[PDB]
Amino acid sequence: GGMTGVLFSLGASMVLGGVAQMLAPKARTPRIQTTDNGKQNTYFSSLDNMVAQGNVLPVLYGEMRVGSRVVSQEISTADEGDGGQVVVIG
Partner 1 sequence: IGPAALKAVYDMARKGARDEIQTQMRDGGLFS
Partner 2 sequence: MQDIRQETLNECTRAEQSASVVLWEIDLTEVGGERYFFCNEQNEKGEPVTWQGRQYQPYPIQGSGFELNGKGTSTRPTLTVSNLYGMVTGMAEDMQSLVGGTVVRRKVYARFLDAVNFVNGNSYADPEQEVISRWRIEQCSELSAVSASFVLSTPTETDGAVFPGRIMLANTCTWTYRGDECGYSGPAVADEYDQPTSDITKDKCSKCLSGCKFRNNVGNFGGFLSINKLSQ
Q: Which residues in this chain contact its own copies in the complex, by CB under 8 A?
A: 33-41, 48, 50-55, 69
Query: Cα 43 vs. chain centroid, distance in angstroms?
Result: 4
Question: Closest distance between partner 1 and the C-beta of residue 37, in Å?
Answer: 26
Question: Closest distance between its own copies and the C-beta of residue 72, in Å?
Answer: 15
- Residue in 6, 51, 57, 89 binding partner 1, rule: CB under 8 A: 6
User: Identity (one letter) of the amino acid at 84?
Assistant: G
SS3 assignment, position 22: helix
Per CB under 8 A, 29 contacts partner 1? no
Residue closer to its own copies (CB basis): 21 or 40 = 40
- E-assigned strands of 1-90? 49-51, 68-70
Paired sense of beta strands 49-51 and 68-70, if any? parallel
